[PDB]
């Protein structure tokens, strides 16, 4: 039982930076990276539901 | 005849393009009170307008001069009595200014931050 | 095993080596990651004649550091001709004891004010909160007055007293032994503080002057109005939740650092008065009140202060003026009249049987009612720190 | 992340290479300029420090030769005395880049904020032997009586390097065309001599014969603290690059605005990691301890304060840092163990709630950060 | 390889490797004791030069050395007072021996308070004055002395004196190995009789303790010493035996002090750091004859190099600026201190260093005091190539 | 002076122990046992004859004086006498 997307429990680590993080990217940024967007809300939802 | 000179205060300046925009700063200046202080340095470090470049000043209705002092420098730009005009400044990554005038007055001056030749209205 | 009982090497093989290297790894991340906050959590101002002990309920937030009690107090005499002058612990007893329990209902620090004051003196290396006086003629010095008191009320006018307390519960701000983690709905946590009476705070010119803070003739009149307090939570706050929770060094927030005192009797001139440190605590520093009757002298009824070991006998047996050089290394000056302080922080105390360990004072003259006021300073750990429940809503 | 070892290793690198720079060079200190002035009629200078090897500081003395020239009045030092003989201290690096841009009250309260003292005092002792106020480093006389003269001498450290085991806001001056300066202005017959009901900020003496006061000189001695003799190896020069690329700066500000039981936010910038706070409440000519303040507070970006704490325990918090309190008026914050970044973690500011405010109050506002290009 | 200067710099580095592992590892095991080793109380009218047997127990670290004495003015009218060294010179030599015939320390009185002073970072075992009400302060007077012996009254005297063998209390450098059986330790004592403790109106007061109209007729009482001894047992032992620090304990750190003359006014006098060893500090007293001045009868104190080269050459004012930075206060009138720590002076480095003063104003009879403070060990000097 | 201004001599070799440090009195003592009587004031004799003093290195065996009264104008005079070797023999014919 491990998961590829568990950050941790989801109601502790939505809001929480990651470990080395002095500025946070957007998740996307037509004028940008599109399926890249799609799957980085992909991978959000998959650590909020637990596979 | 030929007498050398012992000091002078060699300063960098603010005289090219911001890659931000042309953004100029109205600060009306209140007198007959004190001497008045101008600072930007909190401007200057948190993001916005890099440093003053013009002066835009506009004595219409005033009887008296006003003097405007960069401390980095020593210039000491003096507007005259019934002109507006345009004024380029020395001016450093430290954009203090002490703004001076003869009594009374409250003056309209715009910290400019580009390129603008002088001229002064009426002459004379 | 020549000196001690314990010897560092073999009582670090009395610990999981596998458990503390998992803590020193997990305290890391939390100072790493972690913010320090002090917030001002209660505030009361209160008349010691009808209330004198409250309870006071901290928040429950982050893993707290300690606590910081200001008291602020103001003092009327009363009398017709007479004043009153402050005694020798002073302000520090405006608050005459302070019990800490921690959310899982363990007590934490148990002791007076004046002992509080002094461990809050040994750690810091000066008195505490106090300014020194120099040479320079930018206007340093006493300007705010943060701890501040009268040294004379006459007869008929107001002092106005001010001293903070530093209530510890972790050891440093880098070393986070002893810190609780309180980031819960509720716990049972409460910061319990009893305060100066009109009784206890005022002393008759003959009575003993160890609780006291004013001393004179015209001390039976003196009142107090108002003993104001204030208590500021210190807590680190954003802590570094991983998998499973929050990441947390398990042995740190299970070790209590104590700050317990106690009171012995039974003094006899001429002969060692020994006093046995305890069994399975790790000593940090011990501080010694010979209370001689209601007199407090500077060194001149010992003969000797020493800690004894049961084999390797004396590890440390000097002069009064010898024991107050090795303290006026530590704090740049030295304790009130009559404190003794012992330093034991490289070399914590140990030592796995009872009356092993032992601190020595030999007297020279003894009154009738003499006894010695032990303050203590240490580590302890009785309990496991297991890893903690998530809520998971439906 | 898997930026976060190499900027890791690239520290480790660096740390290893200062500890062979602080272990195998000399530490010199020499004297770069001299000169003796009168303030009437110049009082700004410029100094041209030497270009040799990694410089960690400047030593600044300043003397002055104050005389009342009054008929009856005397005048009395104010509290911030000595520290107003320079006015302002700016630093140029080699490349012409500005380090420091303080002023002389602000430079004297960081020296005294990083030693734990006040700078280059001697504390009073009970000692027998004549330790104490031998060699008068700083001094100057409490009070100048009508037709006396006071000396005055005053120590300025002007810092690069953060430490003297730690090398980091250090500069490198063995560049070939090297732009290296140190402007200084010193405390003319203006600025120096207030009147009663004046503001006595940037003044040093005050009474009711400050008409009268002037200089019959200023002198002044600057030394400059580097490492000679740096190791060479066959690549060249071994040096700790992201301790010369890392600025160490002071720079002070002035504002205004202050409104009874209203908080008055001023902002950190982003770019800067903040290492300390020095707040000097003017409220009009007049200070006061603490007895004209609500609170203290350094308020991230949300609105969540930090330290949000009475005058009082403000100061409790500065006396276990620097073992005594600043002057009346004087605010000290000290963030040295975890630096204000405001790039990691939102947009504090500093907050102050004034209780009374006059007419012209404003708020002077110090600062000491670290700067790179990360 | 190959090259015995590079062979020896190797090995060099795997022995300097092993000995500060070896160190934290004693440093971590050992246990510090101090125990009393002597007490005496004597006359000084009698004798005053004493000799102090230590115990030869685990790892020596250094001497505390209690000093307390009684004086009485027998003169009719008048008083005298205080010195500017005072209690200091109760004291007037100290020195150690190793048990191998090695001279650890031969300060004088006033020298050894001096580096006591600057290794602590305050005047050492003083009390700072504070504004705290609870009554911190003096109160067992472990240094004391009264400023004025008035005629007819008795002054009671103490001092302290930290004899060091060890450097610091983390550094084990200097310290004696006396766990192995061997010679005797031995320490030395001089104090103070009744010709070098009070001065008369006019005389040097350097090593006096009192100095007035009415010195002709004090005289000593009692002087009592006692000496303790500070040192490190349970030592571990690993499978070899004792693990110990073995070019710690095979290096000297050492007290001279010394004095030159010939001093010319507004021309530079050159003191050299004569010997092979890595100077920490130096303390220089300008004895003007007497008279000691707080500077403004120097133009600058210095410190050269071989190619006559200042690496330090401050005013006398600046000079105490950099004192003040270590241990927040001045020292007394006419002490010069230079801290050499960070980076010791070696002559083998850059070549010949010296101690330069030029002073302003010399009067008849006037020396400099000079005090060292310095590591010894032993120079390795491979050959390099070529013998000829 | 008779001995009355040093402390001591010696010889040490690696700048750190020594060999011979004896004070004054035991030094000229040891040249009674050569000379039979004490050679004058401010003469200081040491005998090496029987082992010569022969290093491979420079100053790998020194000569030390520990004094006790230095005037100004102090001197040290050294005199040696030594064996050394040719680089080659000596040509007989």
């Known amino acids: 039982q491990v998961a590829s997307n568990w950050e941790g429990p989801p109601y502790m680590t939505y809001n929480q930076p990651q470990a080395g993080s002095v500025t946070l990217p957007v998740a996307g940024y037509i004028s940008s990276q599109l399926n890249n967007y799609a799957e980085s809300l992909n991978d959000y939802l998959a650590s909020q539901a637990g596979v | 005849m030929a007498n050398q000179q012992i000091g002078g205060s060699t300063v960098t300046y603010n005289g090219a393009i911001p890659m931000g925009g042309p953004v100029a700063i109205n600060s009306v200046i209140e007198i007959a009170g004190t001497e008045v202080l101008v600072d930007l340095k909190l401007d200057y470090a948190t993001g916005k307008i890099s440093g003053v470049q013009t002066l835009y000043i506009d004595l219409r209705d005033f009887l008296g001069d006003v003097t405007v002092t960069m401390p980095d420098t020593g210039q000491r730009i003096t507007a005259r009595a019934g002109t507006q005009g345009y004024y380029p400044v020395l001016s450093t990554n430290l954009m203090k200014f002490i703004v001076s005038a003869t009594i009374d007055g409250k003056f309209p001056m715009n910290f400019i931050n580009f390129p603008i030749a002088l001229g002064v209205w009426p002459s004379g | 095993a020549q000196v001690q009982q314990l010897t560092p090497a073999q009582q670090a093989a009395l610990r999981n080596q596998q458990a503390m290297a998992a803590n020193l790894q997990a305290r890391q991340i939390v100072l790493q990651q972690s913010y320090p906050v002090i917030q001002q959590v209660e505030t009361q101002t209160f008349d010691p004649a009808n209330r004198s002990v409250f309870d006071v309920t901290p928040a429950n937030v982050g893993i707290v550091k300690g606590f910081l009690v200001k008291v602020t107090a103001a003092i009327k005499n009363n009398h017709a001709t007479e004043a009153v002058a402050l005694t020798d612990f002073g302000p520090a007893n405006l608050v005459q004891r302070v019990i800490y329990y921690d959310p899982d209902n363990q007590r934490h620090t148990e002791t007076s004010g004046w002992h509080l004051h002094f461990v809050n003196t040994a750690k810091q290396g000066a008195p505490f909160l106090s300014s020194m006086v120099t ?236 006894r010695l006021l032990m303050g203590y300073e240490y580590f302890t750990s009785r309990t496991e720190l297991v890893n903690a429940g998530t809520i998971s809503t439906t």
């Open chain 3, 135 to 370: 040479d320079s003629p930018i206007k340093y010095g006493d300007v705010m007055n943060v701890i501040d008191a009268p040294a004379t009320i006459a007869a008929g006018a107001t002092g106005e007293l001010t001293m903070y307390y530093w209530v510890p519960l972790a050891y440093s701000e880098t070393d986070l032994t002893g810190a609780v983690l309180a980031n819960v709905p509720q716990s049972k946590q409460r910061l319990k503080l009893e305060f100066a009476n009109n009784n206890t705070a005022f002393a008759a010119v003959g009575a003993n002057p160890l609780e006291a803070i004013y001393q004179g003739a015209g001390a039976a009149d003196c009142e107090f109005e108002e003993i104001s307090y204030t208590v500021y939570q210190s807590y680190l706050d954003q802590l570094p939740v991983g998998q499973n929770g929050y990441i947390l060094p398990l042995i740190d927030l299970s070790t209590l650092y104590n700050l317990e005192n106690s009171a012995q009797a039974g003094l006899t001139p001429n002969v060692d008065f020994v006093v046995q440190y305890a069994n399975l605590y790790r000593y940090l520093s011990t501080i010694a009140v010979f209370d001689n009757g209601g007199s407090f002298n500077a060194g001149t009824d010992i003969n000797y202060l020493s800690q004894r070991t049961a084999n390797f006998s004396d590890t440390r047996k000097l002069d009064p003026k010898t024991w107050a050089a090795q303290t006026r290394r530590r704090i740049a000056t030295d304790f009130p009249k009559g404190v003794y302080y012992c330093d034991n922080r490289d070399k914590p105390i140990y030592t796995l049987q009872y009356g092993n360990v032992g601190f020595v004072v030999n007297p020279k003259t003894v009154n009738q009612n003499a």
